[PDB]
From Swiss-Prot, chains A, J:
Homohexamer. Interacts with the portal protein. Interacts with the capsid vertex protein that forms pentamers. Interacts with hoc; one hoc molecule associates with each capsid hexamer. Interacts with soc; this interaction reinforces the capsid structure. A total of 960 subunits of the major capsid protein forms the 160 hexamers. A proteolytic cleavage by the prohead core protein protease gives rise to the mature major capsid protein during virus maturation. Major capsid protein that self-associates to form hexamers, building most of the capsid in association with pentons made of the capsid vertex protein and one dodecamer of the portal protein. The major capsid protein self-associates to form 160 hexamers, building most of the T=13 laevo capsid. Folding of major capsid protein requires the assistance of two chaperones, the host chaperone groL acting with the phage encoded gp23-specific chaperone, gp31. The capsid also contains two nonessential outer capsid proteins, Hoc and Soc, which decorate the capsid surface. It comes from Enterobacteria phage T4. This is Major capsid protein. It comes from the Viruses. Belongs to the Tevenvirinae major capsid protein family. The chain holds residues 210 to 261 of 521 of the full protein.
UniProtKB/Swiss-Prot annotation, chains D, H:
It comes from the Viruses. Homohexamer. Interacts with the portal protein. Interacts with the capsid vertex protein that forms pentamers. Interacts with hoc; one hoc molecule associates with each capsid hexamer. Interacts with soc; this interaction reinforces the capsid structure. A total of 960 subunits of the major capsid protein forms the 160 hexamers. Belongs to the Tevenvirinae major capsid protein family. A proteolytic cleavage by the prohead core protein protease gives rise to the mature major capsid protein during virus maturation. This is Major capsid protein. The lineage of its organism: Viruses, Duplodnaviria, Heunggongvirae, Uroviricota, Caudoviricetes. Transmembrane segments: none annotated. Major capsid protein that self-associates to form hexamers, building most of the capsid in association with pentons made of the capsid vertex protein and one dodecamer of the portal protein. The major capsid protein self-associates to form 160 hexamers, building most of the T=13 laevo capsid. Folding of major capsid protein requires the assistance of two chaperones, the host chaperone groL acting with the phage encoded gp23-specific chaperone, gp31. The capsid also contains two nonessential outer capsid proteins, Hoc and Soc, which decorate the capsid surface. The chain holds residues 106 to 157 of 521 of the full protein.
Swiss-Prot record, chain F:
The chain holds residues 1 to 131 of 524 of the full protein. This is Portal protein. Forms the portal vertex of the capsid. This portal plays critical roles in head assembly, genome packaging, neck/tail attachment, and genome ejection. The portal protein multimerizes as a single ring-shaped homododecamer arranged around a central channel. Binds to the terminase subunits to form the packaging machine. Attaches to the host inner membrane most likely through interaction with host yidC and forms together with chaperone gp40 an initiator complex to form the prohead. Homododecamer. Interacts with the large terminase subunit. Interacts with the major capsid protein. Interacts with the capsid vertex protein. Disulfide bonds: none annotated. It is found in: Virion; Host cell inner membrane. Signal peptide: none annotated. Belongs to the Tevenvirinae portal protein family. The gene is 20. It comes from the Viruses.
Length: 52, 52, 52, 52, 40, 131, 40, 52, 52, 52
């Protein structure tokens, strides 16, 4: 609620942004494993069973 | 500015995902990552508008 | 009314709307996104352990 | 009575069956406390995750 | 008597095809798989 | 799980299934080299004696779409690039013109049932289908 | 961390399709059932 | 090499496989220490069982 | 004698033989070799010294 | 000699075994593990020279 109040107030509002371009050279040179890595996404699983 | 994601996946997992569930899921990981990037842009557009 | 294109903001935090204008041109936009590079895949492996 | 008008069946022609499901995730560890669901319907994308 | 027995409602045992009776099972039949939709 | 039921194509598959079964029922066996000369490209499947699961389709998918396909992609695009070049376009247009023709008040390529057949009733129906 | 993971070689867990990795299994590919010979 | 001329194979389409067996039993309890079995290469029939 | 398949163990430690049985029914062999994955090749090169 | 006698005695049995996926999968520091290099092999060509 407090956050919503500050948002309504215009005091603190939504934002998102891309990464500074210096990473462009650093990352092309990774191009995978590194000290300044890209984060990761994937999936897991689920399953259920039902007795008759 | 940049935006970028890592898949970080193994081998045996896909071999079994295919044999067991009919999915290689490398394509799925690709899907997830690319999807997430597009979702993020959609929000940046909206969020920047609301901000401004 | 056949006049405004209505979209749903599924992430509204409270309840609000934004009304705006977009012209037939790209200059008459208010907000811009010049992608230049997008959703470009990377494929390979790290041969040290040879994982994808 | 209203037999099964709004109910699924999945007939179980063999008792004690099973069903699968899959959640997409983000945060480098599909099996971990705190891992987040990429497409959970109630939540937005973690745009910062792939950005600055 | 030859009996079926039952499961303990232990998802593990069900998954494994293990009941208290005379015979074990192959495992639960597959009733499909559910994935979430991707937002527009 | 995501079984290749192909319910929208399955009624066609039924014809293929029958033909396949005949390949197994028939005695076209005891062949040193694997019976083929020119056609579709083979990929490994489990294959061990009777190991022909639906996953065979999936193994075929796994081992393809990269080898073969990239080559194909290059060849087709190349052919189109050649097609649009000067005098390539002509050579093909003239070849095509001679190969496939149309003319006023004439027939077009057509089925010619002038050699022995089981029945004229059937021949009439074959001509109807040809059209 | 898209890890295959594995079973603990605990038949219970194998049968139940439980591993340490990203996904679970449907079941362990049944290969038929053995009958004993009946003597002459 | 002596490849598999002297072994069964039952090629896999799974990371794991299982084999089930039936055992003919007797003495009113299929699962018990001391339970008896009808078919076994090294044991005779219990003639006094159905008998006197 | 037309009765037993004859195989030589080129690595026999001293001097012995083993006799055994395999039936016409693959499921009945004693030993079950059930391959799932075989000879998956890997290849690449080291990003730091480029040795293959 | 002593080992061979113990082997005849049945004290020691020749054995070979494969690896758990859980081990092989993370060789060469994959996914944060360590001290697990792959076993590896190559070859060496020697030379001999004569006098005519």
């Amino acid at each position: 609620a407090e956050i919503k109040k500050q948002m309504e107030a215009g005091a603190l509002v939504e934002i998102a942004e891309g990464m500074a371009t210096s990473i462009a050279e650093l990352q092309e040179g990774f191009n995978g494993s590194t000290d300044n890595p890209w984060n990761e996404m994937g999936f897991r699983i689920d399953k259920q069973v039902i007795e008759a | 500015k940049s935006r970028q994601l890592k898949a970080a996946y193994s081998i045996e997992l896909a071999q079994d995902l295919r044999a067991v569930h009919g999915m290689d899921a490398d394509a799925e990981l690709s899907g997830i990552l690319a999807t997430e990037i597009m979702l993020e842009i959609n929000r940046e557009v909206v969020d920047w508008i609301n901000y401004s | 009314g056949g006049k405004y294109r209505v979209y749903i903001d599924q992430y509204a935090k409270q309840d609000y709307f934004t009304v705006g204008y977009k012209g037939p041109n790209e200059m008459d936009a208010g907000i811009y996104y010049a992608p230049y590079v997008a959703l470009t895949p990377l494929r390979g492996s790290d041969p040290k352990n040879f994982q994808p | 009575l209203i037999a099964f008008d709004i109910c699924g069946v999945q007939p179980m022609n063999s008792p004690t069956g099973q069903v699968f499901a899959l959640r997409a995730v983000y945060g480098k560890d599909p099996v971990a406390a705190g891992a987040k669901e990429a497409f959970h319907p109630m939540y937005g994308p973690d745009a910062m995750f792939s950005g600055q | 008597a030859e009996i079926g027995g039952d499961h303990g409602y232990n998802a593990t045992n069900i998954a494994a095809g293990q009941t208290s009776g005379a015979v074990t099972q192959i495992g639960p039949a597959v009733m499909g798989m559910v994935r979430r939709a991707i937002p527009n | 799980m995501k079984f290749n039921v192909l319910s929208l194509f399955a009624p066609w598959a039924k014809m293929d299934e029958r033909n396949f079964k005949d390949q197994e029922k028939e005695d076209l066996v005891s062949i040193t080299a694997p019976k083929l000369d020119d056609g579709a490209r083979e990929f490994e499947v489990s294959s061990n004696e009777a190991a022909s699961p639906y996953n065979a389709a999936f193994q075929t998918i796994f081992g393809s779409y990269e080898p073969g396909m990239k080559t194909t992609r290059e060849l087709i695009d190349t052919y189109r690039n050649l097609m649009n070049n000067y005098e390539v376009d002509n050579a093909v247009s003239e070849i095509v013109s001679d190969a496939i023709v149309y003319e006023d008040d004439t027939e077009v390529v057509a089925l010619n049932l002038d050699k022995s057949k089981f029945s004229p009733k059937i021949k009439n129906m074959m001509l109807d289908e040809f059209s």
